[PDB]
């Protein structure tokens with residue numbers, strides 16, 4: 001029998017942010033059963049905490065309802081906040097398939113409130129499928145070049161001219177299903193405050209509330225396209241239209257040709273706790 | 279304020295099959311607005327909330343999809359009945375809903391509720407009258423039977439497919455289907471005592487549902503009306519196969535078209551998990 005906790009990631013109160021189900025003592029579960037359990041929970045991801053293999057504190061496997069991911073932001077944020085309760089550490093090192101991700105935990109009186117990760121440095125290139133994507137989204141143009149970033153998963157970015165235009169999107173999910181192993185992140189905003197919406201049939205979700213692995217790349221994206229400065233922290237608010245407002249903090253340090261750090265951070269809170277029969 | 283819940287996999291005898299429902303106990307202190315939010319947090323096709331009775335039943339149940347409330351629904355109530363059945367020795371349970379009181383018979387094995395049967399509301403029906411639009415949304419040219427919509431609280435449209443291969447091949451346009459409000463699109467194929475179903479409902483906040491319990495009753499009526507089975511003949515409807523959530527619903531509609539005396543839907547259910555929430 002496995003205990004799990006539900007964490008609302010990128011939120012300071014239950015019912016906001018993006019839920020993840022974090023399953024403890026999962027070494028006995030085969031990955032095919034992990035996948036099935038994630039299908040059962042039907043949250044954007046469920047995670048599994050395994051004994052470490054390469055010097056971290058744990059090894060974390062990450063599953064959408066339909067696939068395994070080698071890295072994801074909300075799921076690992078939630079896992080780090082839940083795991084934080086086990087110990088007194090303020091530094092946590094979580095192994096994933098993309099490598100070991102360092103976390104700084106924000107604690108008060110030993111109690112975990114928030115966490116900050118150092119993400120893998122993404123690479124990027126032009127999508128090369130603009131007409132198709134914009135048709136799918138129901139729009140004419142992107143405000144900035146449409147590029148796709150890889151840090152484990154992949155994330156494509158499409159800019160909108162206003163927050164109203166971003167909220168007005170009604171994408172064709174079936175057309176979006178032609179975009180494999182990627183999530184589509186639409187953004188709008190100004191200066192240090194940006195809004196996002198994410199759509200990914202490839203990762204099993206019509207619309208996700210907080211796509212944590214997209215936040216760092218967006219910050220890169222905005223700085224490469226002159227809208228913010230490298231090293232300038234931004235707030236990205238996602239999930240508003242679906243009732244799941246999620247605040248992601250991101251900061252990309254260095255320069256386009258040589259990034260040195262991609263930090264994403266947020267609050268998380270416990271929604272519930274229980275146990276599954278297998 | 280804290281609430282205990284159980285996750286029941288409805289219309290399955292083993293965990294990880296069937297259709298999950300999250301059942302929250304002692305839920306009277308949650309306003310409907312918060313119940314809707316909790317149902318979104320769980321993100322299951324439905325969550326239910328167990329309230330004290332007002333009309334002589336055992337409990338009053340409110341039912342929520344990720345995006346709306348429903349006056350009745352079959353997998354959520356089945357799972358609710360199995361869950362509440364653990365707390366009682368009784369053979370029958372009466373669950374008040376907005377559609378009236380639904381009677382259940384509980385089946386035990388050893389000291390354990392393993393299944394239940396309900397008597398569903400008798401539906402009304404008519405044609406949908408929008409065949410061309412719906413068929414284009416589904417990605418096909420027609421139905422094997424007249425496209426009709428049944429109402430037993432929620433609404434269910436039925437589109438017949440000529441084979442199981444044809445049914446598994448559907449890749450509907452979710453957005454185009456969102457233009458059909460307040461209903462679920464149930465696509466079926468099969469023969470005799472054995473049918474496959476797939477359900478799609480942007481209106482009820484699900485791309486594809488695993489086991490649409492309130493559709494099982496109407497489908498047996500629909501098949502009897504259209505001469506593919508006889509009234510009163512039990513059928514097995516297997517739903518959710520293509521999404522990896524095989525679910526087995528048993529349905530029997532007794533009487534005749536002009537006068538149905540019982541629409542019975544039953545199935546197995548199993549506990550997958552349980553827990554507590556912080557509000």
Ligand SMILES: N[C@H]1C(C(=O)O)=CC=C[C@@H]1O
Pocket residue numbers: 044045071072073074075153183200203205208210211212213214
């Ligand atoms: N939660 C998202 C995720 C993330 O980084 O949090 C990556 C890809 C898809 C998921 O829905």
Ligand SMILES: N[C@H]1C(C(=O)O)=CC=C[C@@H]1O
Pocket residue numbers: 297323324348350351352353354432462479482484487489490491492493
């Ligand atoms: N499970 C379904 C339901 C039912 O009767 O189980 C009714 C309407 C939509 C839900 O996804």
